[PDB]
Amino acid sequence: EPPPGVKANMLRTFSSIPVSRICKSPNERARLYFLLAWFHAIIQERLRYAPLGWSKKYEFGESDLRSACDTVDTWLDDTAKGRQNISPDKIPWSALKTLMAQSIYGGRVDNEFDQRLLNTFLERLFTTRSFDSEFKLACKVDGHKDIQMPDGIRREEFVQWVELLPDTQTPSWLGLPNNAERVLLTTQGVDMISKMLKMQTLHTTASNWLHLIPQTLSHLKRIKDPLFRFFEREVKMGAKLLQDVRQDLADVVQVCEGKKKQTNYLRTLINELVKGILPRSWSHYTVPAGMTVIQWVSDFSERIKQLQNISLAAASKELKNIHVCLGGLFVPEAYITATRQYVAQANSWSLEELCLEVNVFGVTGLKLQGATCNNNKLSLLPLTQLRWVKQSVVTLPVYLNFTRADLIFTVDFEIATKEDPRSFYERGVAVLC
Amino acid sequence: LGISSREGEEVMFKTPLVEKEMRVTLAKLLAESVTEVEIFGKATSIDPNTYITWIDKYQAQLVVLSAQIAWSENVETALSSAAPLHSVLSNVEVTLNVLADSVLMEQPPLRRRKLEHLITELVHQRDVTRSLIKSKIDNAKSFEWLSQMRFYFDPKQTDVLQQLSIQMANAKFNYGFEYLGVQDKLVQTPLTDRCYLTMTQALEARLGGSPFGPAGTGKTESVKALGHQLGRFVLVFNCDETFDFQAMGRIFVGLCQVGAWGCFDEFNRLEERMLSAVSQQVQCIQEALREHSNITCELLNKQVKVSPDMAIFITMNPGYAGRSNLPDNLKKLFRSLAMTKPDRQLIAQVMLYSQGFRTAEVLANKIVPFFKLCDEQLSSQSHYDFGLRALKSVLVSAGNVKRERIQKIAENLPEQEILIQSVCETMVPKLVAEDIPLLFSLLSDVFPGVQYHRGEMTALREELKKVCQEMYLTYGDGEEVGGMWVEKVLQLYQITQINHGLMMVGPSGSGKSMAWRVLLKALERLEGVEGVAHIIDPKAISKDHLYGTLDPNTREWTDGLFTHVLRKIIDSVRGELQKRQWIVFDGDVDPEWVENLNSVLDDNKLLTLPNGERLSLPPNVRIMFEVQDLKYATLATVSRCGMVWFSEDVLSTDMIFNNFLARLRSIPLDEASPMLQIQRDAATIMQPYFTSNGLVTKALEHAFQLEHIMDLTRLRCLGSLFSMLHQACRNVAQYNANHPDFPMQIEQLERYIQRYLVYAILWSLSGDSRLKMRAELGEYIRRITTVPLPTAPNIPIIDYEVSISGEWSPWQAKVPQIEVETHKVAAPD
Amino acid sequence: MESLKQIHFLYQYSLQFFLDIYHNVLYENPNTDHTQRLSIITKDLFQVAFNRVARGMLHQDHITFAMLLARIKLPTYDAEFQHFLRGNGLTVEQAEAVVRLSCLPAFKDLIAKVQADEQFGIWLDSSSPEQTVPYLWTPATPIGQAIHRLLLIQAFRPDRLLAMAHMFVSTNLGESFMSIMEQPLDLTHIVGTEVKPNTPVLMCSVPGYDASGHVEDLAAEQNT
Ligand SMILES: Nc1ncnc2c1ncn2[C@@H]1O[C@H](COP(=O)(O)OP(=O)(O)OP(=O)(O)O)[C@@H](O)[C@H]1O
Numbered sequence A: 001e002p003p004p005g006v007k008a009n010m011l012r013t014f015s016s017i018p019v020s021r022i023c024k025s026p027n028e029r030a031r032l033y034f035l036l037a038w039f040h041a042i043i044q045e046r047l048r049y050a051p052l053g054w055s056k057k058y059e060f061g062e063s064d065l066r067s068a069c070d071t072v073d074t075w076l077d078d079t080a081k082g083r084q085n086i087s088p089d090k091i092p093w094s095a096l097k098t099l100m101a102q103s104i105y106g107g108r109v110d111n112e113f114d115q116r117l118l119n120t121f122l123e124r125l126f127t128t129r130s131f132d133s134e135f136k137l138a139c140k141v142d143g144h145k146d147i148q149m150p151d152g153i154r155r156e157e158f159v160q161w162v163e164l165l166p167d168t169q170t171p172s173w174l175g176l177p178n179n180a181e182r183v184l185l186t187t188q189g190v191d192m193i194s195k196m197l198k199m200q201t202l203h204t205t206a207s208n209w210l211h212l213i214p215q216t217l218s219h220l221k222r223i224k225d226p227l228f229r230f231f232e233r234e235v236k237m238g239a240k241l242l243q244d245v246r247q248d249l250a251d252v253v254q255v256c257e258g259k260k261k262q263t264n265y266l267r268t269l270i271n272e273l274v275k276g277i278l279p280r281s282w283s284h285y286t287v288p289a290g291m292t293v294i295q296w297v298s299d300f301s302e303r304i305k306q307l308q309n310i311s312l313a314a315a316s317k318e319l320k321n322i323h324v325c326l327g328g329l330f331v332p333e334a335y336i337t338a339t340r341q342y343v344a345q346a347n348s349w350s351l352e353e354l355c356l357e358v359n360v361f362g363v364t365g366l367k368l369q370g371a372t373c374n375n376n377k378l379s380l381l382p383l384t385q386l387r388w389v390k391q392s393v394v395t396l397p398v399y400l401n402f403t404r405a406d407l408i409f410t411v412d413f414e415i416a417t418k419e420d421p422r423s424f425y426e427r428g429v430a431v432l433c
Numbered sequence B: 001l002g003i004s005s006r007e008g009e010e011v012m013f014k015t016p017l018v019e020k021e022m023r024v025t026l027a028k029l030l031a032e033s034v035t036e037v038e039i040f041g042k043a044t045s046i047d048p049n050t051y052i053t054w055i056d057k058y059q060a061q062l063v064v065l066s067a068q069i070a071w072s073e074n075v076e077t078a079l080s081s082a083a084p085l086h087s088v089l090s091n092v093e094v095t096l097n098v099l100a101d102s103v104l105m106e107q108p109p110l111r112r113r114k115l116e117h118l119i120t121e122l123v124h125q126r127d128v129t130r131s132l133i134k135s136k137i138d139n140a141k142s143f144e145w146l147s148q149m150r151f152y153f154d155p156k157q158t159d160v161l162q163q164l165s166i167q168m169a170n171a172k173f174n175y176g177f178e179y180l181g182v183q184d185k186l187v188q189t190p191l192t193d194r195c196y197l198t199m200t201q202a203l204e205a206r207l208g209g210s211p212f213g214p215a216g217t218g219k220t221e222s223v224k225a226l227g228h229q230l231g232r233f234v235l236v237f238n239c240d241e242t243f244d245f246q247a248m249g250r251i252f253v254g255l256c257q258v259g260a261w262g263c264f265d266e267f268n269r270l271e272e273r274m275l276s277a278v279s280q281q282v283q284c285i286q287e288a289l290r291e292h293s294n295i296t297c298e299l300l301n302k303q304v305k306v307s308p309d310m311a312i313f314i315t316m317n318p319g320y321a322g323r324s325n326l327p328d329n330l331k332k333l334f335r336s337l338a339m340t341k342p343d344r345q346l347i348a349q350v351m352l353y354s355q356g357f358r359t360a361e362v363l364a365n366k367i368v369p370f371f372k373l374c375d376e377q378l379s380s381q382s383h384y385d386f387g388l389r390a391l392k393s394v395l396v397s398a399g400n401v402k403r404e405r406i407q408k409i410a411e412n413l414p415e416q417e418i419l420i421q422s423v424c425e426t427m428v429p430k431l432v433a434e435d436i437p438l439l440f441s442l443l444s445d446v447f448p449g450v451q452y453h454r455g456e457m458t459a460l461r462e463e464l465k466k467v468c469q470e471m472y473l474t475y476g477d478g479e480e481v482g483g484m485w486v487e488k489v490l491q492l493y494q495i496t497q498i499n500h501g502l503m504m505v506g507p508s509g510s511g512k513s514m515a516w517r518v519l520l521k522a523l524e525r526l527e528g529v530e531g532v533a534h535i536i537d538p539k540a541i542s543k544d545h546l547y548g549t550l551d552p553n554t555r556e557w558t559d560g561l562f563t564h565v566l567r568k569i570i571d572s573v574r575g576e577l578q579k580r581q582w583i584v585f586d587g588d589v590d591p592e593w594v595e596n597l598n599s600v601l602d603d604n605k606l607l608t609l610p611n612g613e614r615l616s617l618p619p620n621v622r623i624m625f626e627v628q629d630l631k632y633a634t635l636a637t638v639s640r641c642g643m644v645w646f647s648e649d650v651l652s653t654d655m656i657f658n659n660f661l662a663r664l665r666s667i668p669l670d671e672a673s674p675m676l677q678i679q680r681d682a683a684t685i686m687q688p689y690f691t692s693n694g695l696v697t698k699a700l701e702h703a704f705q706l707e708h709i710m711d712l713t714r715l716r717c718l719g720s721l722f723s724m725l726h727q728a729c730r731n732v733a734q735y736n737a738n739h740p741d742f743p744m745q746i747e748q749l750e751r752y753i754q755r756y757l758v759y760a761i762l763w764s765l766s767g768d769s770r771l772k773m774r775a776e777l778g779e780y781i782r783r784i785t786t787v788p789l790p791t792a793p794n795i796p797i798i799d800y801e802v803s804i805s806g807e808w809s810p811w812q813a814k815v816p817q818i819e820v821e822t823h824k825v826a827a828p829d
Numbered sequence C: 001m002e003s004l005k006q007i008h009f010l011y012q013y014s015l016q017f018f019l020d021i022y023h024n025v026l027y028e029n030p031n032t033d034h035t036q037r038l039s040i041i042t043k044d045l046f047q048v049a050f051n052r053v054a055r056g057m058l059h060q061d062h063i064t065f066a067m068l069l070a071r072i073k074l075p076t077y078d079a080e081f082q083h084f085l086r087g088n089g090l091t092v093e094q095a096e097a098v099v100r101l102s103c104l105p106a107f108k109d110l111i112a113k114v115q116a117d118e119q120f121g122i123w124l125d126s127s128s129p130e131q132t133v134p135y136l137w138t139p140a141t142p143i144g145q146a147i148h149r150l151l152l153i154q155a156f157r158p159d160r161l162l163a164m165a166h167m168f169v170s171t172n173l174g175e176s177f178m179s180i181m182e183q184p185l186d187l188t189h190i191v192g193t194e195v196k197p198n199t200p201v202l203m204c205s206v207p208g209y210d211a212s213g214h215v216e217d218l219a220a221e222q223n224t
């Protein structure tokens, strides 16, 4: 498997590379190999801290690093064929950076935010400044420490430098703000305990869970405006799904109460309910994978209250003023385009020429994960205003879920001056609904 | 003596074996073409009186290649010496302007294709030059110029195959000079450039390239386009389970012997066995040719010589239901690349300028966000596509509508209405009724004003009137009882002109079979061309039966259903090619057989065989699928073909009632005769019921309020009612035959048929339910009906037979209380 | 070692495995006094058994089985040791974990100590609490101490628990007991040592990593 921590993969990378290849002059090659190796290690650990490290869990295997080594070899060999030294400025930094960001480590990258964050790291590392003795590979920890790039010119020094790395590694080496472990190990430790601790009626079960659901989910009541049509469609879907699921659950209750009715579909539904798994028949709006029936019922209660409020307000048109919950809707991209169309009609611009501005349409419920501020100066959301207008900032995603699986809503926020914008991509910032 | 080009751009040899001949001819022609195009390269202002002649003198691939070579030479020379770069930009801009003005006027055949090709090529060249100029480059050999597809020519090169060379980022290829044909040129977008970069890397590394991502984003198209850009003939194979380890080995043997480019559509259903064996084979050949670069290879336990020009390419669509994972030892042998969003705005801009629209930039910048808005807005149906395929189809529709309007009339033609007319042609049909109010309104907010009203082929309308009256079907013209259905028929006629491949979709009882039948017959009448159809049920036979099978021990491919129908078609011994020939599929969807068609419902309409035999669809052929719903279809299936949504309201209740009455009146049960006479009489009796609300529609709609043991569908129970009323007529016929001197008169037949029809509705509708539900339908029938009914206060209406005298009789008259034999108390029967 | 099968489907081991392990740790012991030989082999059996077991195990449990070897280096502390398996200012989770840890007498005073030790409050926010643990709990040995530190980190900062467990393995078997894994597996040496003929060499790979590329290099290495 890929190893744990940066040091392990760095040592394995040096082991894999034959000494007869890396040793050949110009000496610059050796340093660049180390640089490449270091970068690979960060990637090889960022995957372990998804989704913050990478929104999509791409694989970066042996062949990627092998093609990387071939690319570096080709570039340096053709740069100064026959010489014994290349100046720091004469390395084709931009060329290798492009071949890195687009093909080798970007070939499997699809979401442009990840492709943006690969280019950010490549700009951070592959530069002339790498050959400066004061160059820092990254920040070591929050306590005012930095990993100083080794000043040697041989693997016989770089390998030793890698061995002498500190034991107390944290994700801050990777640019993440040392929080994945706070869940990851926090699970594994408990799992560890369980492992050594492992080394040394259907109807009643369903009825206990289904008795109180009717007291949880309330009951819903049902011209050419771009806003009033979409919300009518959405509340129609809400009422349909509400009646379907509630009828199914009540029929399961009657089965448990003893009024026969044990049909095939009801039998399967009971078998799924007792296990606590979400019935696949009800997956009419995207949810986190493996979500439980209890979480589903809570989300359904909240959605029912949301749609009840929406119907009561719309009946009273006024959908520019009535609040919304992005992500709380079933197809929020439809709502976003509905706002686009409403602004286009209300003042008679064309839709293609519009673009969004945001600040703190009134939409609530969002939360900025990986940053915080109160003046549109993001630093490394009780109410939000959105507007559409014709024609030191960071382009962020906004995902419906808490697993960063579905890009739904792109935003451009303004960062505070003292923060490098690059740090906003290494920190894996985004907004969740 | 020459080459008979399919398109018409013929080729004549310089010395009138074959492969060398065509290569030499194309190479010498290319040398002459570049020697001629350097004039326009250096010309300050280009006169069309020489430019169009130069275009006409040579072929599409040749003229594009010559323009590319000259532009690359000019840019490299300008960088070697921002004055000269601005001069090259001005030259290419002038060429683009004269070409874009030339395309406005009509042109002979085989030329406008070349003009479109050169429009695409020149806008690509201008884009590269402008990007280079803005990010100013002073060094000739900087990477930002080295990384683009550069072309070099040296006439000093004695042998006539190697003068042209292509150079890319750390790469040097030689153009194939194999005859590629016209086809079409793809717009150069950033992701196509990324594909070229990585594919070139892999080819220099003796590997293969593996584009992947959502289906329908130019993976196979990018592969084949780059193959054309290197002069290498591209073979696309329709991979699926039918391909065993020996078949793929034979394919690799052929590839290595000929040195062609092996394009593969979907490495996701070869099964792990024939996937791992292929992994072994590709690793073997890759290592062999790596040794060659610094040879014979053991293909299927046979040493075969292998050319350096061969290559492997693996398209895939990971993430979909009908797909399988891969071994890692295979995946390490292919340089992967993810494609998810080809830049549509630039594509639309270049295509519209290729057609020559006045405001092509504005049309593209409007049409692309229109697609995005509509995709984000409309309901999440199971067959809505708005991806790249829909954009290409609507753009080609816009081009054809421009041509039609020009022929109707020239330089002041409105073009927004053309776009609206194309969108309504190809995008409106797939919509559900609830999605009509949104989409049109969206078109109001992307194209304000420019209101459009559809034409009409009234000749087809009258022919449809004639056949629809012939087949005892009701006919309308847009708003009458027969309006919606015939309107959908004209919609299908419009769609079959574009999408060679189509899906009629909707719930059962919509009229899809009737729709395409009436359209085939009407087109046959209108154009006087035999409209021939072949109906196939996919699941009713095995997939192997559907497509056929290869014996494992010799070359004998037993044809299946679809393959045999095709082989008969392209054989055309009976002049089948001179007939409107349709293959109609009727069943349900399963990827296991659907995605084997993915290479014949797509721009490159062609499927392959395990033997390597290739079958293309002739132009007249159309493929059509009649389907209920699309619950189990990948995005590829939806994107491959156009849609027609036959909602449940395409046939009103009165429509089927009138069809039943017409069939009753016209054709007899045995084929005014006696049977016909009683049929017409009975139709007269029940005429106030088989129409509008009446009683039959009321009962039919009431039937869906009651519980059933199976799914109540309107058309099932209504066919039941029709059949048992046919039996009512047969009963009257038997009664008349029973009295050869006292035939039934109107005063008896009226009572008989009225009571029979009431009983028929009441039973046929509630034909499968519990006793209480049948009683409930009886109560409904009592409430609505006008016929007299039994006066028993508590006997259900279902408990009465209709006497041949036309009088109700309780069933208790037919249940004798008998005493069976003691010999046979409970014996069988 | 045979009880490992409860955790995974790959954790299948034979008696020949242990026979080979003991045969090599005996004949190939790094040493000539009898007591010296016995002490050295007592350490070497643990070391070689851990190495051989965990070179064919996934990383998430490389600590796990290792610590169970430290279960059988114990004088004995079972009564308080088996608590953290029984049960599974401050936060709710920390509060309940601490109250459950208070069942044992040794930490019975924590209810007062955490109230008095403000430096403990600061240590709760330490970046590396395992490296510096306060002792809020009548002799005490290094191993008993390390067990107490494991229990404390479980109660308070379980996020770093896996780290502190390593130190416990160091407290009994050595700091270098685990350091043999953070390196590339020298396939030539292990193949020449442990793999006799008739022993099939299984290379199992987590998805996304191919093992074959290693062995081919070995085939290139040995010129075989
Ligand atoms: N426009 C029409 N006018 C009158 N009768 C019609 C019309 N369209 C269809 N019908 C009748 O409706 C019945 C069902 O239509 P059709 O035979 O076309 O089925 P279909 O399209 O194959 O149905 P399915 O979707 O259930 O597979 C047939 O009796 C057909 O004659």
Ligand SMILES: Nc1ncnc2c1ncn2[C@@H]1O[C@H](COP(=O)(O)OP(=O)(O)O)[C@@H](O)[C@H]1O
Residues within 6 Å of the ligand: B186, B187, B188, B189, B214, B215, B216, B217, B218, B219, B220, B221, B222, B315, B342, B347, B388, B389, B392, B598, B602, B603, B636
């Ligand atoms: N750059 C482009 N401009 C216009 N249309 C394109 C472009 N690239 C691809 N297309 C269209 O996209 C479709 C999908 O091509 P393909 O890669 O074969 O799909 P798949 O391989 O997923 O079946 C083709 O029909 C092609 O016409």
